[PDB]
Design a protein around this motif. Structure first.
Motif: not given
Length: 330
Positions: A188, A195, A317, A325
């Protein structure tokens, strides 16, 4: 600590998902749109211009014994879909699915734009992108996740959105019964506050996989999947009669069509979006032309893995020191 809350589509098309949130003391329960593409927790309230409230449940800070006005603080936000809202700020107790944050900034709307007024099912937003995007001025405020993180068993939340069915947001743990196979994690970038990650490519239906880097954001607050024009053209070319309509504002297709699936890459792994997930129904009531769930990102300036994509997966997340992620099939 952990929390777990059910998230429910607002309508028969899965246009968005609402999750109940307890605010204040005694609790005032509002149904909020959990949005990993923004970072403000804002609500319809007793302060919202009366003509701009139409069926929503409101937060009334004066009835909360734990509410405190955050002196001098205001907020104002505009979303990618052209909608907007603004107001003042309280701190109050906020709980999601059993997980409680004290001193959470609750942004009380004085004004909302017409699209919010017109949607009676959404009482506000709960932002889950990075706190760097929070609009509160002059002192930026933290998201619910940022405030809860240190207390969580693990510094994560997961999105498990349903197709035409309820799903779940979990905070602080990974439900290993909620997905099949393994979770593939991917890097990420937080540089834009999102994100943001890079998909490794795509396939259309049973077609061969095209290895190509697609930078985009995991955004639970966006309904559709927005991808580069080349990719979208390749998808809709497989649907007889599909066309891009300037008047409608995207690709439309005959409602009698059976849509092919769309696969996206997460590292060496593959997430398959069934064709039916890409059908967003008649463009207007009674029409036999249907709106597509995969649209061009050209002119958005960013690719968006919205609900169409995310609901095909179990999504982690991971808010570790270096965020990542995770995606699994389910």
């Amino acid at each position: 600590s952990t929390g777990s809350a059910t998230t429910t589509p607002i309508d028969s098309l899965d246009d968005a998902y609402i999750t109940p949130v307890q605010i204040g003391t005694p609790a005032q329960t509002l149904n909020l749109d959990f949005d990993t593409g923004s970072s403000d927790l804002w609500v319809f309230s007793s302060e919202t211009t009366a003509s701009e409230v139409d069926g929503q449940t409101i937060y009334t800070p004066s009835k909360s014994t734990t509410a405190k006005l955050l002196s001098g603080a205001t907020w104002s936000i505009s979303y990618g879909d052209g909608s907007s809202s603004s107001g003042d700020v309280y701190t109050d107790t906020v709980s999601v699915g059993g997980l409680t944050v004290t001193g959470q900034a609750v942004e009380s709307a004085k004004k909302v734009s017409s699209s919010f007024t017109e949607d009676s099912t959404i009482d506000g937003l709960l932002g889950l992108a990075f706190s760097t995007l929070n609009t509160v001025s002059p002192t930026q405020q933290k998201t619910f996740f940022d405030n809860a993180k240190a207390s969580l068993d693990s510094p994560v939340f997961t999105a498990d959105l349903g197709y035409h069915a309820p799903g779940t947001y979990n905070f602080g743990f990974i439900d290993t019964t909620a997905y099949t196979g393994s979770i593939t994690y991917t890097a990420v970038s937080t540089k834009q506050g999102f994100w943001e990650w890079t998909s490794t490519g795509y396939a259309v239906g049973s077609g061969t996989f095209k290895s190509t880097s697609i930078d985009g954001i995991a955004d639970t607050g966006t309904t559709l999947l927005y991808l580069p024009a080349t990719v979208v053209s390749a998808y809709w070319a497989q649907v007889s009669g599909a066309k891009s309509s300037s008047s409608v504002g995207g690709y439309v297709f005959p409602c009698s069509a059976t849509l092919p699936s769309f696969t996206f890459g997460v590292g060496s792994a593959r997430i398959v979006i069934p064709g039916d997930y890409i059908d967003f129904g008649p463009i207007s009531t009674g029409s036999s032309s249907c709106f597509g769930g995969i649209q061009s990102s050209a002119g958005i300036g960013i690719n968006i893995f919205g609900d169409v994509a995310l609901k095909a997966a179990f999504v982690v997340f991971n808010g570790a020191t270096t965020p990542t992620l995770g995606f699994a099939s389910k």
